[PDB]
Every structure is written in C-alpha cells, then in structure tokens.
Ligand binder design. Structure first.
Ligand SMILES: [Cu+2]
Ligand SMILES: [Cu+2]
Lengths: 128, 128
C-alpha cells in the first residue's frame, strides 16, 4: 500500500494537490511537506494542518491570532488532528498520525494556516 | 499637485508600500488601487481601507463576518474614514477623502480586509 504522500507549497501560494485519500489498510499516515520557493517564512510560510471541514475556519482564525511565533496555530488545539511546523524557502518537514483518529463518514480538510493562505491552499482528505 | 498615491496589491498578499504620507496642504487625498497578477477576487481580493489604529482590528473582524458579497466590509461602519471596493486581478478602484477627516493627535492605519490579508497588508498613514 501507499501510506504517505509528498506535498509541496510554493511561492505562488499553492499546494501541488487538492485531494488526499488515506487507505483504510494503513495504521499510520505520513505527510512530507517541502517549500521549493525562494521566499522566507514570515512572508510565504506554509504548514500542513488537518481538521474536520466544520472545524477548519475556527482553526484558521485562532491560528492567525496566535501569531508567527506559534507557527500560526492555537497551542494544544483540540480541533487539530495533525500538523507540520511552519516552513519557508528550501525547508522541509514531515508528520505522521494514527489512522485511528479518523472516522469513516466524516469529511476532513487539509490547509495552510499562514494568514490568508487557506483561500487557495486547501483540499479534501478522506479514507478510501 | 501631488495629493495622491498609487498602491498595488499583488498575488503574494503584499501592498507595494507600508507607509503613506498626506501633505497637510492638500484639501483632499486620493488613493488609486490596482491588482497586477492573475488571481480573482474570491481567493486574492484586495481593498484599501482607512481607520484610526485603535479601530483597525474591529473593522477587520466585522469585515470578515460581512463576507465577499459586501467586499468584506461592514455596511455603514462609522469607524471607516475611507474605503475602496474589493478588486481582483486586472481590476482597479480609487477613493478620495477630505484631509479634514485626519485629526490632531490621532494615528491612522490602512489595510486590506479580505480574510487574513491584514497580517501583511497593513501600514501607517500620516498627515504632514
Ligand atoms: Cu502557506
Ligand atoms: Cu487583500
């Protein structure tokens, strides 16, 4: 099986995919995020964050108010299933999470929580 | 004479200036906003909005809740000294306001109210 995905967030404020399917046969799933652009974190930072679709907007909004030093995420936010750190040009980061934290039937979203980025940098995740 | 400024908002969520000076010998001041770049206003819209620094955060927050169809600005907002409409790539808008609206002993800020954008898209405007 394939229990991981490789994703890029670039200088044009885009992810290079908008759809991830997590095989039910996986015990854990891994996201490897990279930044092939030239701009630094404080002006084009990207992270990869996972939540219910219903929870995305709250997570995005409290993330902005938490600020850059908190990688634009509410500390210990109950809504966040999994997250990478915030990265800039030429950096990379991975995160692994337990597939047990998901629920067949629920709708999940992945997104970047850098202010304004989720209007473009978002997509759907679902178990297969 | 010079009582105007040309401002851009681009696809990287930046204004091309973060400080605007008004000459006190102007009766009126005009801002010409443009959007170079190719993303449309529903994912990268920009406006130019002016308030006291103390009121910016309330204008921005009420703006997000007003939504896209109201240019992310609360209708009849007494806190707003001047505003453009929300524009996308290839579009333009201008706004003119009375310099008499800028008072003694107040500090003013300009910003975009599209969700998240004011984190980078903000600046100071001063009368001298
Ligand atoms: Cu981002
Ligand atoms: Cu904007």
């Amino acid at each position: 099986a394939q229990c991981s995905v490789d994703i890029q967030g670039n200088d044009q404020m885009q992810f290079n995919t908008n759809a991830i399917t997590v095989d039910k046969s996986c015990k854990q799933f891994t996201v490897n995020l990279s930044h092939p652009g030239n701009l630094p974190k404080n002006v084009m930072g990207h992270n990869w964050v996972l939540s219910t679709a219903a929870d995305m907007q709250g997570v995005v909004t409290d993330g902005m108010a938490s600020g850059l030093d908190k990688d634009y995420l509410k500390p210990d936010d109950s809504r966040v299933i999994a997250q990478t750190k915030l990265i800039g040009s030429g950096e990379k980061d991975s995160v692994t999470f337990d597939v047990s934290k998901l629920k067949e039937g629920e709708q999940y979203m992945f997104f970047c929580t850098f202010p304004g980025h989720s209007a473009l940098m978002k997509g759907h995740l679902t178990l297969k």
